[PDB]
């Protein structure tokens, strides 16, 4: 198959982590480069640790490769930073999302 650009999916953790002072973020990448691409991340626009470790990806049933980067750090970080961003090589250009905790004000969570 021919090439194709690699999707943006932040799936973080819930609450339960954060008050288990545990949180790391993973970001999702399928139909991507033929298994060339690089493990990157940062807070919104500053860059963070990079306290990634990934390896080279693999070859699915789509006849493509995938990969995927986890960072993990402390949870006081997620909502003390401003959003997160996973940096990927493909078509030598970069992905950037602006991610949150929240996503809700006029209703909260109670007792």
Known sequence: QPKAAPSVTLFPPSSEELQANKATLVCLIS???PGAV???WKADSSPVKAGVETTTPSKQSNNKYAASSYLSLTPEQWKSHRSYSCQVTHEGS??????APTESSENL???
């Open 94 to 99: 970069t992905v950037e999302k602006t991610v």
């Open 109 to 111: 969570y109670f007792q």
């Open 31 to 33: 139909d991507f480069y």
């Open 38 to 40: 690089t493990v990157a």
